[PDB]
Amino acid sequence: KMLGYFSLVGLLRLHSLLGDYYQAIKVLENIELNKKSMYSRVPECQVTTYYYVGFAYLMMRRYQDAIRVFANILLYIQRTKSMFQRTTYKYEMINKQNEQMHALLAIALTMYPMRIDESIHLQLREKYGDKMLRMQKGDPQVYEELFSYSCPKFLSEPFLQQLKVFSDEVQQQAQLSTIRSFLKLYTTMPVAKLAGFLDLTEQEFRIQLLVFKHKMKNLVWTSGISALDGEFQSXXXXXXXXXXXXXXXXXXXXXXXX
Amino acid sequence: AMFEQMRANVGKLLKGIDRYNPENLATLERYVETQAKENAYDLEANLAVLKLYQFNPAFFQTTVTAQILLKALTNLPHTDFTLCKCMIDQAHQEERPIRQILYLGDLLETCHFQAFWQALDENMDLLEGITGFEDSVRKFICHVVGITYQHIDRWLLAEMLGDLSDSQLKVWMSKYGWSADEQIFICXXXXXXXXXXXXXXXXX
């Protein structure tokens, strides 16, 4: 049935290239089949399946599922920041395809967690490293320019990607994260400090709007907003502490076992 | 009325493969028209229509597509509007008035309510047949308000709801149970054991 699964995956991919998102998703849902047949038949097929899963995740709002499938197809940085190293068994062309898939995953990968990893990736290229720096900067002007220059990469069929839709959506999410990163933690905040920080965002009026909008998102919490004063206000602990202690013990265990 | 009468047949169509035959568009489009007039709704049927248009481009119908998108918006905060967008390619999204409708939807999604009402050509043709469109939008706005405000200026709420008179505002406050205040009123042993274990582990 492995061949049939491959046919399904290929057909689904074709539909996605010329096909609607939901039907392809349904095909993907049917599609998964035992790992082992694929492993016995060839190294590459599993990688292709992982790539398909990653694509589905990308279509899906969640980047988590795709993050797992892509790492398995290719090595990815693990939670707790340990290197994940993939097998080199698959045929070199297949490996190149896998590398391309990994490059695609970076987009999913950045969303999943952190932070500035390109160690597996070649140092010299500024295509991905530059993008990472721009995200780190937290300023769109550099981000926008990065899309503008590497307009060619996004385009690569033209009808299939007429408008660059996905990249733009991703960038808009990316812009929001830094503001949440201050993440309140202040009981009461001067308006002017908020204005200075929100000013950087392209819309001048966003803070009156941009700040309230952030509250609606719920990523960050604002207190006293819309107030006459105009100044924003901003067992559980034990559980958190216990959690940390657990992590420490885990690290020690791995050390001892090692 | 008509919606309920067509419901059974449409449901049967959607259960099988005939939903992929564009010959059934005439029936599905009349179904969409009935959803608009009676303020009824059927997302599955509407997505099937969009799919038929994407697969059979020559059948693309501007009015039906616009009504499907507008009705999808009336169903926010649900994912309806986003799903419909997934069913329309870039070329068609860029055409009038689909481009304009998506722009309006964008204002709603990003919750810029004042901007929405301002940009909304109140006397827009497509809106006339879509029964309850304006009030449906207000329900979404009140959904957002109930989540993002503790207290809110009476004047501000009326603005966000489309510049309502005090009498109309009262209707919505009443609907969600909001009332004016000063203003409209809107809104051990185990642990010890754990430490002991953790400590022991550390010592080891």
Q: Is B56 on the interface with A (CB under 8 A)?
A: no
CA A81/CA A115 separation, integer angstroms:
10
Per-residue DSSP letters for chain A? Answer: -HHHHHHHHHHHHHHHHHS-HHHHHHHHHHH---HHHHHHH-HHHHHHHHHHHHHHHHHSS-SHHHHHHHHHHS--PPTTS--------S-HHHHHHHHHHHHHHHHHHHHSS-----SSS-SS-HHHHHHHHHHHHT-HHHHHHHHHHTHHHHH--TTTTSS-HHHHHHHHHHHHHHHHHH----SEE-HHHHHHHHHSSS-TTHHHHHHHHHHHHTSS--BSTT-SS--EE--HHHHHHHHHHHHHHHHHHHHHH-
CB B3 within 8 A of CB B40: yes
Please list every residue in chain A whose beta carbon sits closer than 8 Å to the beta carbon of residue B54. 20
Q: What is the largest CA-CA distance in chain B?
A: 77
Q: Is B196 on the interface with A (CB under 8 A)?
A: no
List the single residue in B87, B112, B204 with the smallest CB-CB distance to A20. B87
CB A54 within 8 A of CB A101: yes
- Of A109, A111, A112, whose CA–CA distance to A74 is shortest? A109
List the single residue in B47, B55, B198 with the smallest CB-CB distance to A245. B198
List the single residue in B144, B194, B195 with the smallest CB-CB distance to A216. B144
Asked if the Cβ–Cβ distance from B198 to A246 is below 8 Å, we say: yes
Please list every residue in chain A whose beta carbon sits closer than 8 Å to the beta carbon of residue B146. none
Resolution (angstroms) equals 11.6
Please list every residue in chain B whose beta carbon sits closer than 8 Å to the beta carbon of residue A213. 110-112
Please list every residue in chain A whose beta carbon sits closer than 8 Å to the beta carbon of residue B87. 20-22
Q: Is B51 on the interface with A (CB under 8 A)?
A: yes
CA B27/CA B6 separation, integer angstroms:
9
Please list every residue in chain A whose beta carbon sits closer than 8 Å to the beta carbon of residue B51. 20, 23
- Of B35, B28, B33, whose CA–CA distance to B10 is shortest? B28
